Design a protein around this ligand. Structure first.
Ligand code: NA
Ligand code: NA
Ligand code: NA
Length: 100
């Protein structure tokens, strides 16, 4: 799966939520390419389970302008997962995101 994403200044975008609520499964990693203009974006992996209101952070990478990096994910099986990519800058981020 691949997505061309526009991430507005001081904003985040949630991508690739995957629900496997009965039988948990390991998850694919996320390849992130930051093409600018934002000097960096931070991609994080989140997971949850059926009896909580929270998502839990487990893993993070920073991707600078011009960088092509994979955010690794845990070896664990999960019931619910998603990624959040954060643009903590005043410039728009044009990024690509795909599962690998
Ligand atoms: Na906001
Ligand atoms: Na809930
Ligand atoms: Na991770």
């Amino acid at each position: 799966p691949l997505s061309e994403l526009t991430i507005s200044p001081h904003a985040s975008v949630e991508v690739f939520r995957i629900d496997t609520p009965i039988i948990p499964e390991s998850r694919k990693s996320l390849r992130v390419v930051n093409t600018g203009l934002a000097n960096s974006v931070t991609a994080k992996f989140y997971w949850s389970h059926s009896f909580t209101s929270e998502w839990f952070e487990s893993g993070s990478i920073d991707v600078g302008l011009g960088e092509d990096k994979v955010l690794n994910v845990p070896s664990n099986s999960f019931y619910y997962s998603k990624f959040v990519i954060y643009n903590n800058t005043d410039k728009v981020a044009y990024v690509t995101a795909n599962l690998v």
